[PDB]
Amino acid sequence: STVPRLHRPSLQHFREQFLVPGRPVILKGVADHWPAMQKWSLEYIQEIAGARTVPVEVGSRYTDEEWSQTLMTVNEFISKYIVNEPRDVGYLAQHQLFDQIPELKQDISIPDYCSLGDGEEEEITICAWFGPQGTISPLHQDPQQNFLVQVMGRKYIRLYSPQESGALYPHDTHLLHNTSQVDVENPDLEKFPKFAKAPFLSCILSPGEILFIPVKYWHYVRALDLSFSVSFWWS
Amino acid sequence: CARAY
Ligand SMILES: O=C(O)CCC(=O)C(=O)O
Ligand SMILES: [Mn+2]
Numbered sequence A: 001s002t003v004p005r006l007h008r009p010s011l012q013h014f015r016e017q018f019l020v021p022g023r024p025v026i027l028k029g030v031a032d033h034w035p036a037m038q039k040w041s042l043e044y045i046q047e048i049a050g051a052r053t054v055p056v057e058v059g060s061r062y063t064d065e066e067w068s069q070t071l072m073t074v075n076e077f078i079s080k081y082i083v084n085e086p087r088d089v090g091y092l093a094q095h096q097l098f099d100q101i102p103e104l105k106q107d108i109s110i111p112d113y114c115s116l117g118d119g120e121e122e123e124i125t126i127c128a129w130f131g132p133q134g135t136i137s138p139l140h141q142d143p144q145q146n147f148l149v150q151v152m153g154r155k156y157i158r159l160y161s162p163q164e165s166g167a168l169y170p171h172d173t174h175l176l177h178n179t180s181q182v183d184v185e186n187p188d189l190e191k192f193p194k195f196a197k198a199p200f201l202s203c204i205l206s207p208g209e210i211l212f213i214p215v216k217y218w219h220y221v222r223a224l225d226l227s228f229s230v231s232f233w234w235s
Numbered sequence B: 001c002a003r004a005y
Helices: A011-019 A042-049 A074-083 A112-116 A162-167 A193-197
Strands: A005-007 A025-028 A053-058 A068-073 A090-095 A125-131 A136-140 A145-152 A155-160 A201-205 A210-213 A218-223 A227-234
Touching: A011 A025, A011 A112, A011 A210, A042 A074, A053 A074, A068 A074, A074 A090, A074 A125, A162 A193, A162 A218
Parallel strands: A005 A025
Antiparallel strands: A025 A210, A053 A068, A053 A090, A090 A125, A125 A227, A136 A218, A145 A210, A145 A227, A155 A201, A155 A218
């Protein structure tokens, strides 16, 4: 089924119906007035961030054997992996761009819902996810609550509850134990038969929308267009 | 925020 969409729910409603039970939801009317929503174009990103060095993941999926990480300027990333017919998929993923470039922080806001957590605002981790159509983050789970805010483009997102972990065949190794062995959109059902019947939620996340990903909820993400998302990891 | 370590 689909992830529910709610317009600006009260803190108490979000707490009781979503945060405490650990249920995903899309929040509307919360981030649609970030300055980023109108300001962030490729040209703006080049002007504010183009000369800075960022880590770039190169390859279809971080679970691939050919996949690698490199360093380049934001201008180089845009030129090589977005605008010119790219030779490979590149992704500026999982990067604390707003600590690197404080000016961009003025264009976003931490959702007020984060104040319901038991952690300090100073410990909230804010990451940028910027890349072309077709980037894929394989199915994985994270150790904190997350608000994933879509600024540019759309993403297809599949969510599996922690209760379904046995059907998702987590990797055995330490570096990948938070990651599924299954390719969500083309699963090997001969090797991973339990995956076929595992229930899930899905959505297309569009600009101005926030997806709440409960702590430890398994999530898979594919960009459908040139995309920029901002995540807030909080407890 | 990493998933790739
Ligand atoms: O947008 C993506 O590719 C992945 C986002 C993610 O895994 C996160 O925000 O924790
Ligand atoms: Mn994640």
